[PDB]
Write an enzyme that holds these catalytic residues in place. Structure first.
Site, mmCIF file in Angstrom:
data_model
loop_
_atom_site.group_PDB
_atom_site.id
_atom_site.type_symbol
_atom_site.label_atom_id
_atom_site.label_comp_id
_atom_site.label_asym_id
_atom_site.label_seq_id
_atom_site.Cartn_x
_atom_site.Cartn_y
_atom_site.Cartn_z
ATOM 1 N N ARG D 39 0.820 -1.216 0.000
ATOM 2 C CA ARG D 39 0.000 0.000 0.000
ATOM 3 C C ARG D 39 0.852 1.264 0.000
ATOM 4 N NH1 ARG D 39 -4.154 -3.247 0.850
ATOM 5 N NH2 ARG D 39 -3.743 -4.139 -1.240
ATOM 6 N N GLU D 184 -14.253 -15.641 7.660
ATOM 7 C CA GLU D 184 -14.035 -15.166 6.305
ATOM 8 C C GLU D 184 -13.492 -16.225 5.371
ATOM 9 O OE1 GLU D 184 -11.490 -11.731 6.058
ATOM 10 O OE2 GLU D 184 -11.233 -11.914 3.907
ATOM 11 N N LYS D 226 -17.821 -13.039 6.651
ATOM 12 C CA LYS D 226 -17.232 -12.111 5.662
ATOM 13 C C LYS D 226 -16.924 -12.903 4.384
ATOM 14 C CE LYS D 226 -13.211 -9.071 4.926
ATOM 15 N NZ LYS D 226 -12.342 -7.899 5.148
ATOM 16 N N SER D 268 -14.814 -6.639 -0.338
ATOM 17 C CA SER D 268 -14.894 -6.094 -1.695
ATOM 18 C C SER D 268 -13.946 -6.780 -2.662
ATOM 19 C CB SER D 268 -14.604 -4.592 -1.691
ATOM 20 O OG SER D 268 -13.208 -4.354 -1.737
ATOM 21 N N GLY D 269 -12.972 -7.495 -2.111
ATOM 22 C CA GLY D 269 -11.990 -8.216 -2.910
ATOM 23 C C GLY D 269 -11.714 -7.809 -4.350
ATOM 24 N N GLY D 270 -11.056 -6.674 -4.552
ATOM 25 C CA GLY D 270 -10.739 -6.265 -5.908
ATOM 26 C C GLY D 270 -11.680 -5.278 -6.560
ATOM 27 N N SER D 297 -17.493 -4.905 5.037
ATOM 28 C CA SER D 297 -16.299 -5.070 5.858
ATOM 29 C C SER D 297 -15.230 -4.826 4.805
ATOM 30 C CB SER D 297 -16.173 -6.482 6.425
ATOM 31 O OG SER D 297 -14.972 -6.614 7.175
ATOM 32 N N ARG D 300 -9.693 -2.025 0.952
ATOM 33 C CA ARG D 300 -9.394 -1.078 -0.116
ATOM 34 C C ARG D 300 -10.609 -0.263 -0.560
ATOM 35 N NH1 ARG D 300 -9.811 -6.292 -2.396
ATOM 36 N NH2 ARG D 300 -7.782 -7.295 -2.765
#
Lengths: 341, 341, 341, 341
Positions: D39, D184, D226, D268-270, D297, D300
């Site tokens: 990041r 998750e 999640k 949101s994974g991507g 949850s 990014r």
């Protein structure tokens, strides 16, 4: 490798929803020749085919007040091919009053070697060709009963595994022939266990059931579940309120039954007609979110007074039918939480 | 909760050992009416009951040279109740030559919804009363065939789970009636997969089998295993020696089959009579410790030349029987690693 | 997707065979700081690092008569990095006397919520980098202990499932770093259960173990199994002969442990030095085919008299070492069934 | 053997509900030192502790408009023990703005031998003492990430089994220390598979998850899930509408996630910040009954613009915080289906 096409899924789903539409429930008149024999015995009535036909007729032709209450009725092989005095095939009578025709396809329980009197059930052989034929002859849903008993070392892991697995095979074969499968993993009330114990076993069993249904690729929206309500054992010392068993029941279900399951049709298993009605009513009044229809699939809880009021005398048809219509209307109300004994 | 008593265990064990005693194997003449029909067809012979009876008679009454080679013979329901010209019931002929009578109890394969053309098999319904009757009529062991196919996504987990589980139910029900169950989880040779691939799938399947047998409390000493040998697919490009497939086969077995299993009776599944014999011989010559009997349970690999030499003409009885006696003696030797083509 | 290459499989196999070669066994001197603390306590010896080092030295440097008897010795992290008075690193001493160095990698047991006092064990975190380091520092095999207890409702299904699964993860990670994993699913002798009960649970547990080992793709030829012998509970009323427990033990193993498993190294779990030796001897004399090496992996059964004869006095080195050499030689003979007390 | 007392269940449940109360979601700022490093890299900022602290501070102290939108925030070990310029411990800042403090307890993924690049995750060792400490230091919920990838032969059965099982151990240990576990089981969007394929795998995985949670006796009302939303693979050829993925997502969940599960916090994974918001909004607008909270949850999807607007310059604090507050408010609305881009 889709087990079902969109068209098939829709047919199964539609059938399922129709059966448990608001205020509607199921009449389980599928007692086999041996079961119904006990019934007829309790009222000194010979177990003949005609006596059986007359009795099923008696229930299937009650006046139309029962129409909005009966979403479906389960029949035994014989009955499905019998006719009412007016010549109409029973499936037709049932269908003309707005109900879906159900057929029991299981061939009873068998002993599970190496266990403490536990069982599994048979009936898978040639079940596919059987369902295809039943479909053609009017049936749109089926019922297969598995039995588990709470005890010291029961239900054992084997019992839970094998019964959940066979229920899945059964469901799979049904949906392949356009028949909505009612999965019935009944946990006998026999024993002296308390509420908690029952809620515990029911949760474990139910969890084992749906994992199986998943492994066998079954379409949940096109299924119904006929479980036992969570109650203390018949010989349990402790006493519980209807609210308590309603709470234990809805809770056990909220943590095992995926919301996709179209509905839950409770078996009364031993409860009295009034009791089954009060409890079903308490369940729909339980202060928890219920994502599926909560109704009935009663056998004795719907036929008790009627059978007794019939006693085998043709001159009692009316009095007998009135008892059934009485319970059916009561339970229709319980399925909406509006039953006021 | 002992599923079997010491007395029962001993009977099952004794039967099992007798079947695979040194140098002995099984003659699988259990082709159903549909299977044997294909057979008779291949030699322009009408599929009548008499033709079938005559053919089974032909094999069951070969001269006594076959006696020390035949530890058991599997029959189809029909045959078990047929008689030789001299009036003796087939089970008696078989038993008089020193062999154990076997009965196929499975009712064929059925499609597994949601899978890529995979199957499971039926026949559990009323199997217990069936075994009890077969026991009374001479049978001491049974056979139930499950079929798996190696492909892109096969065998799928469901296929492996369900077939292993049904084989266990079958075994359980058998041992309850004093019948030694032959568990047959055949992995079709079809496909273009190589040796390694087959050895891999066979190991996984076999592991799933015995875990099941364990969950269902089955007594291993009173069982037999009829698996496929580990070989490349029929359409496999690569080529392998008998030593290689013998090594891959014994290896796959050494890491899945508990030593308690009384014996392994290989199915020839497609191999030629000579091939099945050479491989069985290589397997018994494999440089690894084999804790169980390694013999044969052949169908075509024992009937090929005989059926062909019979062509349906009664005048060929002798020539036909000689072919069978030839293969049976050859395989008896292969079961001891002394076969010298 | 081969988990191991041919080269890796061979290294693991070789190591495994070396450890249990004829007449050889394992010295389990891997007591952690807490365990060995109890030990030193029983002889009024302070639990210091030097006292621990001296004690491990005492056992690791016994005269060469112990050489042909010791195929391997398990060490605790600390010891693996300690040195003998002559400056040689302990792993070197062990390796110079012809033994393979073993390292315990598990980090003890932890409670399994929702069960009746059952446990699972931890130690997987960073296990891979740990094995890689241990490999570089001399270790060629490892040990991870899981504990199950026989009781009313134990071992529970969860306990059996989770412990078998964790043993598999452990084994997988080991073989990835060239370390032969010793799978130890010990079933505590605590309780008042009889022989049959123990043989039953041991069979179920062992079956669950190998199915797991299979699901996790572990190479059996590169593994060893450290199980409990089948014996009645310590508080069992009934009495049994050595022959009986030897029979129950070899039997339980013959129907769960694939012949590919290079060997079985029995834990003495509570038995006296003499007892563990007599039983191991009876096991190798059991009238049944044993397809794997049947030897020892003893802790107390090898250190009992020695620790007692040491009492903490440096002047007792010799007397103490003689006790150990005495038991090691006795057990080496028991592993060949030639022990004559 | 109740794993939790009524008092404990209530605490867990309360915490769970608080986190996903209407309109509230989670800020996943738990990137480990290695993750956050990537990041900081993307904006030419050195990966120092101070830079990390300043960044976490930047997000944790945005103005109060974010208060009703943030039900909880997940922190990495380091951050949980860092302090804002005003000296207040981060957990305090988070708690003072009305949010619950979350702590990531997993120690990353590890390779699963024998599989095609699949993984499981570690972190169970000493997890109990870790949770007890985290509880004392302000955390009330945790997060453990498992990763599965859709491909030719993935997720494999092993992968699904082991990851579901480890998630269960994790959850069990958490609830024992009064920590609500966020399960998750992320299914990477990588690959070229279509919607149906993703919905299929998600259903299977999710089913395997809850069966595990059940076997390990975990209290569902005191948990959060999640999962990945059901979407086509990043490289999928076909195109889908938000309504479609919202339908596939709620459907997959309706047939696997028991209604007792307090809530679903989507990763949101991507997906882009705007994308994740639009989809979450579509999900809450899906024409199907949703029995659980459906919120976010995000990592990014909540920090993207902010990190970019920060670029590492202290003089950008404000502009950067505004971006985060912008997304948090947007997602708060999406969690109620009122997001109007």
């Amino acid at each position: 490798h889709p087990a079902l096409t969109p068209e098939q899924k829709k047919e199964l789903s539609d059938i399922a929803h129709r059966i448990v539409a608001p205020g509607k429930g199921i009449l389980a008149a599928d007692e086999s020749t041996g079961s119904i024999a006990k019934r007829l015995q309790s009222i000194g009535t010979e177990n003949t085919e005609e006596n059986r036909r007359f009795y099923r007729q008696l229930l299937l032709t009650a006046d139309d007040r029962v129409n909005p209450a009966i979403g479906g009725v389960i029949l035994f092989h014989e009955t499905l091919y019998q006719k009412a005095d007016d010549g109409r095939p029973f499936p037709q009578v049932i269908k003309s009053k707005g109900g879906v025709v159900g057929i029991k396809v299981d061939k009873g329980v068998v002993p599970l070697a190496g266990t403490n009197g536990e069982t599994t059930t048979q009936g898978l052989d040639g079940l596919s060709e059987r369902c295809a034929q039943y479909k053609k002859d009017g049936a749109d849903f089926a019922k297969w009963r598995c039995v588990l008993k709470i005890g010291e070392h029961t239900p054992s892991a084997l019992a839970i595994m094998e019964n959940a697995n066979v229920l899945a095979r059964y469901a799979s074969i049904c949906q392949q022939n356009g028949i909505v499968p009612i999965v019935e993993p009944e946990i006998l009330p026999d024993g002296d266990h308390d509420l908690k114990r029952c809620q515990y076993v029911t949760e474990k069993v139910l969890a084992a059931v749906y994992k199986a249904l998943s492994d066998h690729h079954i379409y949940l929206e096109g299924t119904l579940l006929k479980p036992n309500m969570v109650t203390p054992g018949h010989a349990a010392t402790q006493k519980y309120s209807h609210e308590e068993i309603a709470m234990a029941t809805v809770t056990a279900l909220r943590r095992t039954v995926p919301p996709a399951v179209t509905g839950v049709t409770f078996l009364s298993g031993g409860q009295s007609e009034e009791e089954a009605s009060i409890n079903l009513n308490a369940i729909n009044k339980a202060p928890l979110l219920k994502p599926w229809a909560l109704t009935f699939s009663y056998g004795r809880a719907l036929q008790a007074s009627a059978l007794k009021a019939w006693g085998g005398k043709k001159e009692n048809l009316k009095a007998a039918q009135e008892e059934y219509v009485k319970r059916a209307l009561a339970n229709s109300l319980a399925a909406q939480g509006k039953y006021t004994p």
